[PDB]
Design a protein around this nucleic acid. Structure first.
Ligand SMILES: [Zn+2]
Lengths: 649, 48, 484, 97, 116, 426, 146
DNA sequence: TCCAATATGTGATATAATATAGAT
DNA sequence: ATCACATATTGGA
């Protein structure tokens, strides 16, 4: 309607106040709204990358996004002086500090990883806080610990830069799929952190899964890694079964309850309501006693060292420091009792933080900045991929290969634009490398930049003029090898079709790359790639026999959440529409046998399991009984309570 | 290409809708798809 | 180094985010929003609101042998003391009750029960929002809705006129607003409250015969009955917004009527009580209780958030007068224009406490033949320290941190949602308009930030947005229509 | 005679390519014969029939399973408006009960 | 949620396989098992010993006939070994008025000092 | 052949052993064996020794008083309007205490009571029935006059009525569905009606409203059973009678597979291992000469990491099975033909990390799906007869388009294969 | 070439419309296909050449255009001699005429549809359930096209 | 006097993965 | 809360 008439193009000139998420998308002017919405969702679906790189083609609004998002870095807002450092573990310690200006006392804790939810989290770069010792000084702006997304100069990058080409690789790119080289797969690796809790009571005992005959360890130490994908296993102890089951405590038995997780331990916390003396007696829980004494000694240290600070009347302590001191003092205090879910628990409860590096796998989704979703179809050797063997760029290989069929139909031209600009940037860098004069190099660079974005050209002129000759040489060399930054702001300052036309007509030498064994000359160029959360491990499920509901029908269990099982074991539902589609086969008897043996009837299920367990493995023929199904029994009872009874005519 | 389907249809009518001729149609589809993949990787396709 | 140039370019960027908007969650204080909910209980004459303040959190642990227990799950919370005073039959008791409330962590999060919960801004209309054949103002508990009905009334000369009769649907009954105003002030006092004592009159048939032809030429006459009639000035009838009042008045009068019955306030109170219940003996008491409840529909927070002149914000009757006299203009307003909308944070967190208080006070008001002090005590009998936290979590008012990455600016900090307490949005289809985008959203709300699971219900605020300072977090300092 | 033509014309307007035999089956299942016997079609003139909507067809039909397992269980079991007690016709879906 | 069925079916089928092996190994008929089971009541120490012998192979089933078949098989296989008293213990029946043997300090200390 | 809805008379079904006398479910901090959660009658939640099926039904005996059958109540409401005022009892009194209602504004039939209603049911039915609109309902009532009034109320198994006796620090908690309350209510009422001698004349105000409230509670019980347990997606009818949660099921992502037949797919390690676990245990028990539990131990060790022996067993099973270790693959929603396909496993993937079903590209159009990562459901088919029965969902049977009797283009070349063939031939 | 801020608003509004449409159709399609499938699940077929259906009872259809003629393939119709004869889709002589055809709706067999009323397609589709084929063939293109 | 329109009220019913927890 | 379905009054004819 005419309401949109209020929108005046002159009012929003040189303005980006209407853009929000789209600010991270270069050439947002050219992308369609659907792909932009997909990008906004992808930014949430993104995962932290171990080898995060600043974008080659950027909007310069990215570092602002990184700064104002507070979950990745920690900044000591005031000037501080390190009062003390106390170690809980080698991976986790605590720093007590004091504001030099205000005089208040505050606290800063470190850890190797931070967990967000489920199996999602990230590793930390704790080198700045680890360099700090007692009586050192923290400035007003200092990154005590940072994520891998931020580099040394606080530049923020949510993904990697990968050399891409639009190619049809043996029809492995049908619809939208990506084939990626192993070297590029290394750059697309992420972190996986899990907080798994194993609860032990007086009935159950741990098993010597880790160690030898002299050393009894039921769980890995802090530095150790997980073996056989089992954090621990527990056996219920009863005097009747103790004579035979307790012997060979080192090996697993069918009665044991195992707990599955994979990675490296980084923090273990044990809460024990058992008397410490009884643990001293028990050999199987000796490691638990050792870690309990470690936590108690750390709390004793913090009490002894911060009593003067907390209990000094003419002193100010932050609420965080006060709560920390109070919790540690409660833990060292006598008659302390721990409750889980508002219930006093028997035995103890152990919480493990486990960190691993998970790489790129088939079925994992990686996308660009323009809604170009893709599923990794094949991870191939980097040699068995398009290689160019003509010209100066010989030996260059494509890191990823994308589907070229419907690039125009997806209404996302910015993908092609970024690829083209990085492709011509390759030629600019090569021309710079061939020249032997630094002035010639900066002249070529300023020419290309002025052709793309003029403001970046002015800023680079200022930056180069300010640099020392050695610093300028380092700048030039790293630009030649690593790549040149090009700025394509989302809405104003982007490079359009006519600007690219001018660029292509000026640089007459630039032409399509001729690759080995490929008739069509194609273009390879760096584009930005981010990794999405959806993965083959996310929704994988495999159930044969699992826990049955109270009604005798299969149902899901919380075992996968509690890390008691490796895969989901979640039952699929056969919908009513699925029944209709299956009814195409007029063998309703076979469909009813399927549903009865798999779910409705217990006798048919037991018969099926027995036939598959004993008999001929290669030829399986089953005979099923005609006993009424449990679903029919429940129906009969419900209708009986209604006062109606279905009877066959 | 549009006529290919017709051929297949006539095939189904020529051999009396035999199960074997249906198996052969599926085999032809698989082989033609493999050769299509070969043509696509050797003769590249690109948008720019 | 390339990193140096990237940092330099980033620092030299002209366009910058509004830091104050990013840390606006720090600006909101719990006591300011908590005071009106506590004041709601002053409906009961015995209850007096002493006040609420945060109890000191500087308490330090001491070595004890008391066998105290601590949960494995860690929760960072604050404690709020609420102080009331209740006096019954010259016996006064001072009541103090403490409630736990989430404490802000990292300037944008709460930690409760070992889980990361992040608060979310809710988008809601400021006041007098438009719905099909109705204008609605949302109070703390009971929303006041005014519904319009197209009616036809024939002139004494025989020429029919089409007008609009408006009525309130409060307490599950369609009652004309003039009935409420008649019960409060009487028909004469109602005409004087609207300043219409010179414009409208009621007279006898013989008096009508005595009137000259020039007065009939300058007035419009509608005979209520054959015996009694009503006269309204022509200049008043020329305006349709004024025709609304005349149509409501015509709908109020009945065929069986008397001049002294019109002069009787008790007749209006009885008609109201009859609207709500059919028991003739208690109709007066029913109408009196209804008028009391109508007085209590308005809340002070609603008074403050309303942008109208304070003269119209004195009491509920002033608000109804302002709405009715400007009904035609207020009805013709955009529901999605951001100037007519606002964002709120801590307000929806305190709503369960308000619901509990309202239940208790409804119990005390409806109590019959029992000790008032006892029921007043029952109001604050089961108020527990963990009530607010448990109700916040279980009612899923707070959103769990499902973040997958380190970027929190766009997934948590700037997230706005239409769903929530007092939701103007629902999964029903007719609400489709709310899911769409409006031109006034430009420069203030993200255009492509919607969620695929529930389109339009969720989005993200633009970082460059600046809310007017000291404007109650409204998008605009002044509404869409300025009543020129 | 006119609903089949309307169906075909609307199918052409929509571009949906489905053969009219399947559409004729779809329309046939909606209609209910007042005699409820197919043999009356062998007679000289068309028998008495009434065409229903898709929801009313199985609810007003004579099959118990496809009606109970579909929609409006409450009104079927409580009231005889659908003549549910008189239904005796069989169905493959009966085996699922 | 109740316990899963599959693993219990595995264990039960293992028990059945073991009793079939026992029947085929010694050419046992129903009459020989009847001779071994004639007027035999369930004994707690006997089921404990049977659990001990097959503790590595499976878990004991609830049906008494299966336990008695396993008893005869254990008796034969133990008789093949030099063990002698335990098969005879399995064959006889325990008394209802079970009397625990008083602690023998000499015997207990002799066993404690024993190398085995 | 066919199914007929039939009224049932509880008088023949009633068993005195399944009689509930205690309305209060808890007794001495444990569930009462005479309550609605009776373990002796209904069974035990987690005990195999109780051995009580879900088919067990319990009874509440309201003798010697009778009640309207709730299921028929609605019908009666149409035949006799304002039946609620008739069954309810109300009387007024003077200061002296004489009944003073005088029946000025109420019909003589109203407010008589449920016992008077049963005594005067026939004449009242003749009074209020309208033939024009309710002749069929009146005939149905005549045919089933015996089922109209009943004295015993059934209550279904406690395993369907969830009841958990959870323990809390401040206090113990009992979690139950609302239906239980209603049941208990009924019991309480009948007890308070039966403890007083029925032969001795008592005040009607103390007894008749109790009967009316009992009728209301029974009506609500029936209504709640229909509106909660037996209707909708949540209802047992749609959820588990037609559909069901299926054992031996898997959920996998899809990825393109090349150089293989169209009906042959590549299956990951973990999914095939768990789905075909019992057959693999059989094969291991036969090969290694060990009992089945030790074979389960070996499978448990092989499911953790890739074991060459286990993969050799898997490929042996894939090669030597008669039907070919086939399965059914479906993409939700199954709103089109070809959504479910009867396919064959031809390869077991050798990488534990790779967990993607390798499906052929030509199969995408029939499934109406793309490589967007959405999970497809896999249901393995074991029985050979079932294999020959579900082979009608094989790609060969869908090669012929059922609309035209021609070749189905959904199984023809996709757009990329079309580009390749076009480059080759044109 | 680029875009303007007003054009960007229009584009984002269109994208929101698309998402809303997808969300609502996700709910509608299942309901429609469920109703039609539940009704047509019990359609059957029998191997009887002639069901005795009256020739006058064979309903009529108007060959208005070419698509209407395309709908009927492997379909019978009565010539002017009075004998049932197959319909050839290629012949244009039938256009502009109204033809009475043996139809499934006029089948007189209660056990199932005869070979005449279904057509020559019977032998092709006798392996699968007929009503399910029909409901799927109607419901897939309609929802996808919407 | 009747009636059709308006109005009120009754009733079925609803996607897709998913963070939990009322005195002595 | 959307769609259906059914009564209850009431202004209208
Ligand atoms: Zn026929």
């Amino acid at each position: 309607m005419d309401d949109i008439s209020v929108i005046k193009n002159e009012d929003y000139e040189g303005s980006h106040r209407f853009l929000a998420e789209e600010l991270l998308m270069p050439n947002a002017n050219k992308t369609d709204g659907n792909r932009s919405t997909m990008f906004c969702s992808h930014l949430a679906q993104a995962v932290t990358l171990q080898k995060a790189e600043p974008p080659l083609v950027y909007t310069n609004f990215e570092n602002q996004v990184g700064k104002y998002s507070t979950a990745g870095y920690r900044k000591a807002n005031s000037n501080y002086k390190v009062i003390e450092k106390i170690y809980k573990n080698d991976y986790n310690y605590v720093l007590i500090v004091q504001d030099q200006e205000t005089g208040e006392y505050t606290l800063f804790e470190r850890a190797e990883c931070e967990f967000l939810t489920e199996h999602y989290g990230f590793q930390w770069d704790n080198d700045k806080i680890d360099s700090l010792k007692k009586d050192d000084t923290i400035e007003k702006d200092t990154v005590l610990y940072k994520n891998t997304c931020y580099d040394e100069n606080m530049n923020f990058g949510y993904g990697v830069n990968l050399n891409a080409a639009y190619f049809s690789y043996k029809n492995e790119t049908l619809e939208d799929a990506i084939v990626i080289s192993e070297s590029a797969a290394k750059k697309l690796g992420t972190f996986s952190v899990n907080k798994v809790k194993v609860s032990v009571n007086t009935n159950d005992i741990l098993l010597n899964l880790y160690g030898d005959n002299e050393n009894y360890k039921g769980f890995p130490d802090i530095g150790e890694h997980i073996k056989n994908q089992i954090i621990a296993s527990r056996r219920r102890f009863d005097y009747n079964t103790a004579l035979y089951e307790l012997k060979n405590l080192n090996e697993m038995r069918d009665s044991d309850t195992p707990f599955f997780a994979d990675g490296k331990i980084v923090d273990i916390e044990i809460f024990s309501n058992v008397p410490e003396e009884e643990l001293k007696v028990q050999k199987y829980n000796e490691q638990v006693l050792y870690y309990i004494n470690k936590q108690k000694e750390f709390s004793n240290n913090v009490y002894q060292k911060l009593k003067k600070i907390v209990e000094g009347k003419d002193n100010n302590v932050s609420d965080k420091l006060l709560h920390f001191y109070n919790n540690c003092k409660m833990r060292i205090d006598e008659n302390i009792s721990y409750t889980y879910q508002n219930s006093k628990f028997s035995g103890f409860i152990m919480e493990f933080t486990i960190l691993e590096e998970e790489p790129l796998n088939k079925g994992s989704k990686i996308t660009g900045r323009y809604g170009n979703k893709g599923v990794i179809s094949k991870i191939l050797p980097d040699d068995q991929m398009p290689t160019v063997a003509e010209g100066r760029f010989k030996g260059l290989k494509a890191d990823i290969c994308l589907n070229p069929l419907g690039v125009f139909n997806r209404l996302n031209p910015s993908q092609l634009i970024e690829q083209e600009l990085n492709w011509i940037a390759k030629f600019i860098r090569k021309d710079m490398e061939e020249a032997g004069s630094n002035e010639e190099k900066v002249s070529i660079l300023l020419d290309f930049l002025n052709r793309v974005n003029k403001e970046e050209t002015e800023l680079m002129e200022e930056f180069i003029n300010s640099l020392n000759k050695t610093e300028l040489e380092e700048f030039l060399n790293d630009i030649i090898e690593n790549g040149i930054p090009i700025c394509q702001k989302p809405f104003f300052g982007n490079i359009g079709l006519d600007e690219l036309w001018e660029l292509y007509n000026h640089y007459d030498h630039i032409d399509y790359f001729k690759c080995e064994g490929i008739s069509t000359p194609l273009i390879i160029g760096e584009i930005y790639m981010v990794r999405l959360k959806h993965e083959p491990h996310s929704k994988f499920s495999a159930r044969s026999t699992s826990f049955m509901n109270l009604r005798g029908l299969p149902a899901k269990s919380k075992n996968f959440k509690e890390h008691k099982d490796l895969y989901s074991k979640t039952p699929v539902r056969i919908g009513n529409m699925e029944i209709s589609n299956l009814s195409l086969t007029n063998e309703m008897g076979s469909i009813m046998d399927m549903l009865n043996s798999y779910s409705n009837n217990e006798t048919n299920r037991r018969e099926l399991i027995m036939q598959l367990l004993t008999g001929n493995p290669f030829d399986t023929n089953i005979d099923l009984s005609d006993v009424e199904s449990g679903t029919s029994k429940i129906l009969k009872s419900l209708f009986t309570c209604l006062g109606l009874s279905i009877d066959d005519v | 290409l549009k006529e290919y389907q017709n051929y297949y249809t006539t095939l189904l009518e020529h051999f009396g809708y035999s199960n074997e001729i249906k198996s052969i149609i599926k085999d032809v589809i698989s082989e033609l798809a493999i050769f299509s993949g070969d043509i696509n990787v050797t003769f590249g396709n690109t948008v720019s | 180094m390339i990193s140096n140039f990237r940092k330099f370019h980033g620092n030299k960027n002209q366009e910058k985010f509004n830091e104050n908007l990013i840390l606006n969650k720090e600006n909101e204080s719990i006591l300011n929003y908590l005071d009106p909910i506590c004041k709601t209980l002053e409906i009961i004459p015995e209850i007096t609101y002493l006040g609420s303040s945060v109890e000191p959190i500087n308490k330090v642990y001491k070595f004890n042998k008391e066998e105290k227990t601590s949960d494995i799950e860690r929760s960072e919370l604050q404690l709020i003391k609420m102080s009331f005073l209740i006096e019954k039959d010259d016996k006064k008791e001072e009541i103090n009750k403490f409630i736990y409330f989430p404490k802000l962590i990292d300037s944008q999060y709460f930690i409760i029960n070992g889980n990361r919960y992040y608060p979310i801004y809710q988008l809601l209309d400021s006041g007098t929002y438009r719905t099909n054949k109705a204008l609605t103002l949302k109070t703390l508990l009971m929303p006041i809705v005014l519904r319009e009905k197209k009616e036809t009334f024939d002139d004494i000369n025989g020429e029919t006129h089409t007008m609009l009769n408006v009525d309130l649907d409060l307490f599950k009954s369609k009652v004309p607003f003039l009935i409420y105003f008649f019960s409060k002030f009487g028909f004469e006092g109602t005409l004087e409250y609207f300043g219409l004592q010179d414009l409208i009159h009621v007279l006898m048939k013989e008096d009508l015969d005595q009137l000259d032809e020039d007065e009939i030429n300058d007035n419009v006459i509608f005979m209520i009955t054959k015996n009694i009639s009503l006269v309204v000035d022509k200049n008043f009838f020329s305006n349709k917004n004024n025709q609304i009042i005349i149509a409501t008045l015509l709908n109020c009068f009945n065929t069986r009527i008397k001049i002294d019955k019109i002069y009787e306030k008790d007749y209006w109170v009885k008609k109201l009580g009859g609207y709500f219940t059919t028991n003739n003996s208690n109709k007066q008491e029913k109408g009196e209780g209804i008028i009391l409840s109508f007085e209590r529909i308005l809340d002070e927070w609603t008074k403050k958030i309303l942008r109208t002149e304070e003269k119209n914000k004195e009491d509920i009757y002033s608000v109804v007068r302002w709405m009715i006299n400007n009904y035609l203009a207020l009805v013709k307003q955009d529901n999605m224009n951001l100037a007519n909308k606002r964002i709120r944070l801590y307000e929806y967190l305190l709503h369960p406490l308000l619901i509990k208080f309202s239940k208790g006070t409804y119990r005390v008001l409806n109590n019959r033949n029992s000790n008032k002090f006892e029921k007043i005590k029952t109001i604050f009998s089961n108020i527990q320290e963990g009530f607010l936290v448990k109700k916040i979590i279980n009612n899923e008012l707070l959103r769990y941190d499902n973040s997958v990455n380190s970027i929190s600016l766009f997934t948590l900090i700037l997230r706005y949602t239409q769903s929530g307490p007092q939701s103007p949005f629902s999964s029903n289809s007719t609400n489709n308009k709310l899911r769409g985008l409006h031109p006034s959203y430009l420069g203030r709300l993200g255009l492509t930030s919607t969620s695929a699971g529930d389109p339009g219900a969720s989005g993200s605020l633009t970082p460059f947005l600046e809310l007017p300072e000291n404007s109650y977090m409204h998008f605009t300092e002044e509404p869409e229509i300025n009543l020129n | 005679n006119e609903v089949v033509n309307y169906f075909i014309y609307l199918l052409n307007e929509s571009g949906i390519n489905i053969q009219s035999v399947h559409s004729e089956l779809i329309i046939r299942e909606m209609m209910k014969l007042d005699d409820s016997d197919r043999t009356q079609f062998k007679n000289d003139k068309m028998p008495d029939y009434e065409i229903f909507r898709i929801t009313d067809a199985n609810l007003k039909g004579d099959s118990l399973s496809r009606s109970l397992l579909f929609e409006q269980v409450k009104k079927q079991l409580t009231t005889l408006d659908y003549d549910t007690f008189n239904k005796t016709k069989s169905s493959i879906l009966d085996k699922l009960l | 949620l109740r316990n899963d069925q599959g693993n219990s079916i595995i264990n039960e089928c293992s028990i059945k396989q073991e009793i079939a092996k026992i029947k085929k190994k010694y050419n046992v008929t129903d009459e020989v098992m009847k001779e071994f089971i004639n007027g035999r009541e369930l004994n707690s120490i006997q089921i404990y010993l049977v659990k001990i012998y097959y503790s590595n192979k499976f878990k004991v089933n609830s049906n008494k006939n299966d336990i008695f078949y396993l008893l005869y098989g254990m008796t034969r296989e133990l008789g093949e070994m030099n063990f002698s008293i335990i098969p005879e213990i399995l064959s006889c029946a325990i008394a209802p008025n079970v009397r625990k043997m008083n602690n023998r300090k000499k015997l207990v200390d002799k066993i404690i000092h024993s190398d085995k | 052949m066919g199914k007929k809805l039939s009224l049932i008379d509880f008088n023949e079904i009633y068993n005195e052993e399944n009689l509930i006398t205690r309305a209060n479910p808890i007794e001495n901090h444990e569930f009462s064996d005479d309550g609605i959660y009776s373990e002796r009658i209904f069974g035990s939640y987690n005990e195999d020794d109780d051995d009580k099926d879900i088919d067990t039904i319990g009874w509440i005996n309201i003798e010697p008083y009778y009640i309207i059958n709730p299921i028929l109540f609605t019908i009666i409401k149409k035949c006799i309007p304002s039946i609620n005022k008739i069954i309810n009892y109300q009387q007024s009194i003077d200061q002296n205490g004489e009944n003073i209602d005088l029946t000025e504004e109420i019909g003589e039939d109203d407010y008589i009571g449920l016992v008077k209603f049963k005594d005067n049911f026939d004449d009242l039915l003749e009074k209020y029935t309208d033939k024009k609109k309710y002749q069929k309902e009146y005939d149905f009532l005549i045919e089933n006059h015996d089922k109209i009034f009943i004295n015993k109320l059934p209550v279904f198994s406690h395993k369907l009525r969830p009841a958990t006796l959870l323990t809390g620090s401040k206090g113990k908690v009992l979690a139950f569905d609302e239906i239980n309350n209603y049941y208990n209510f009924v019991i309480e009422y009948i007890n308070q009606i039966n403890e007083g001698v029925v032969s001795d004349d008592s005040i009607d105000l103390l007894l008749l409203p109790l009967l009316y409230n009992m009728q209301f509670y029974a009506n609500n019980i029936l209504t709640r059973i229909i509106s909660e347990y037996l209707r909708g997606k949540k209802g047992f009818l749609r959820k588990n009678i037609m559909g069901s949660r299926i054992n031996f099921s898997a959920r996998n992502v899809i990825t393109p597979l090349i150089g293989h037949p169209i009906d042959e797919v590549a299956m990951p390690y973990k999914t095939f291992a768990e789905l075909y676990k019992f057959q693999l245990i059989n094969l291991i028990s036969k090969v290694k000469g060990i009992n089945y539990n030790e074979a389960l131990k070996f499978w448990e060790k092989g499911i953790l990491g890739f074991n060459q022996e286990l993969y050799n067993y898997m490929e042996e099973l894939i090669t030597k099975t008669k039907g070919g270790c086939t399965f059914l693959l479906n993409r939700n929603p199954t709103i089109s033909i070809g959504s479910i396909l009867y396919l064959k496993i031809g390869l077991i993937k050798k990488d534990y990390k790779d967990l993607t079903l390798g499906i052929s590209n030509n199969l995408l159009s029939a499934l109406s799906g793309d490589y967007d990562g959405d999970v497809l459901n896999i249901i393995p088919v074991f029985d050979n007869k079932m294999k020959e029965h579900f082979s009608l969902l094989s790609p060969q049977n869908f090669l012929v388009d059922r609309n035209n009797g021609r070749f189905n283009g959904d199984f023809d070349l996709q757009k990329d294969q079309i580009l390749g063939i076009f480059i080759l031939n044109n | 070439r680029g875009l303007d801020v007003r054009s960007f608003y229009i584009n984002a509004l269109g994208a929101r419309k698309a998402l809303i449409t997808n969300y609502q159709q996700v709910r509608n399609s299942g309901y429609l296909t469920r109703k039609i499938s539940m009704l047509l699940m019990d359609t059957k077929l029998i191997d009887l050449d002639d069901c005795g259906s009256h020739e006058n009872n064979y309903l009529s259809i108007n060959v208005e255009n070419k698509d209407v003629l395309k709908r009927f393939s492997k379909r019978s119709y009565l010539n002017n001699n009075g004998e049932l004869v197959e319909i050839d889709i290629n012949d244009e002589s039938l256009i502009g005429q109204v033809i009475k055809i043996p139809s499934p709706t006029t089948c007189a067999s209660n056990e199932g549809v005869c070979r005449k009323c279904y057509g020559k397609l019977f032998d092709i589709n006798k392996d699968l359930n007929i009503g399910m084929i029909a409901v799927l063939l109607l419901t897939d293109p309609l929802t996808q096209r919407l």
